[PDB]
Amino acid sequence: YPVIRLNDELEVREILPNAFVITHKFPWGGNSLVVLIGEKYAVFVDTPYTPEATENVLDWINKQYGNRQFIEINTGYHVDNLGGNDALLHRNIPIIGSDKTVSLLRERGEATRQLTMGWLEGPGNEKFLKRHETIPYVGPSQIFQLTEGYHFTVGDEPIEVFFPGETHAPDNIVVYFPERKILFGGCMLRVGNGTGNRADANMDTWKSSVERLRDFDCVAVIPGHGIRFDPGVIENTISVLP
């Protein structure tokens, strides 16, 4: 895909008309998604690691495509899912997420920050270590019951939020755009051969939960990390889980 480099840490790829995968490297690359709906709306699935990077994305979208009423959906509680929530909060952008995400952020958020910082103590990681210490951890503001999921419409277009079972973290959910056959899978989907960090993972249910995603009719599937968006990401994920 053509790559728009907003800055040194931020890349944007228009993978389908009006669907943008945002890759923020901080220092690892993590993905979020902006889908423009009509002329007035936009849905943001996940955020970049930081409020400042999230602001850069919001400003770029607004300037390129007209000011949008944004809605965000957090697909987990980690810094790569919601690290930019404060940028949304200060713009009064609704942040949708599950009650499990709220509980996990409250109970595990600071502990996970320390784990993240512990990986950034080496030479060359100084600027990331510093900012990861100070990123404000802000939870969702419009909360649904995890196992119920959530269905809503934005400008007449339906959006579906589905919990398939515990995967990478007990709260991971996927977001499906039926009118576009786009599935944001997030951190439950893997590019390459590894699982990633397993501190919060349920290795007993992860594969069977991802197998449920086979029922979505997909043209594009967004994983949490990595630049690969074909629906075969789902099978790759299944192939690497036990």
Question: What is the closest distance, in whole angstroms, from the C-beta atom of residue 70 to Zn ion in the complex?
Answer: 17
The residue range among 15-23, 62-70, 75-83, 141-149 that interacts with Zn ion, by the rule CB under 5 A, is 75-83
Q: Which is nearer to Zn ion, 11 or 80 (CB)?
A: 80
Give the footprint of Zn ion on residues 161-200 (CB under 5 A).
187
Give the footprint of Zn ion on residues 81-110 (CB under 5 A).
86
Cα distances (Å, whole numbers) of residue 98 to 75, 176, 200: 8, 16, 16
C-alpha dihedral, 78 to 187 to 178 to 156, nearest 10°: 10
3 state DSSP class of 134: helix
Q: Which is nearer to Zn ion, 152 or 205 (CB)?
A: 205
Question: What is the closest distance, in whole angstroms, from the C-beta atom of residue 38 to Zn ion in the complex?
Answer: 29
Q: Which is nearer to Zn ion, 37 or 209 (CB)?
A: 209
If one asks whether residue 51 binds Zn ion (CB under 5 A), the answer comes out as no
Question: What is the closest distance, in whole angstroms, from the C-beta atom of residue 37 to Zn ion in the complex?
Answer: 25
Cα distances (Å, whole numbers) of residue 144 to 73, 96, 123, 147: 11, 8, 42, 9
Cα distances (Å, whole numbers) of residue 53 to 8, 80, 86, 162: 11, 12, 11, 27
If one asks whether residue 24 binds Zn ion (CB under 5 A), the answer comes out as no
Buried b (16+ CB within 10 A) or exposed e, 159-186: bebbbbbbbbbbbbbbbbbeebebbbbb
Q: Which is nearer to Zn ion, 109 or 178 (CB)?
A: 109
Q: Is 168 annotated as a binding residue?
A: yes
Q: Site residues (CB under 5 A) for Zn ion?
A: 78, 80, 86, 187, 224
Binding residues for Zn(2+): 78, 80, 86, 90, 168, 187, 225
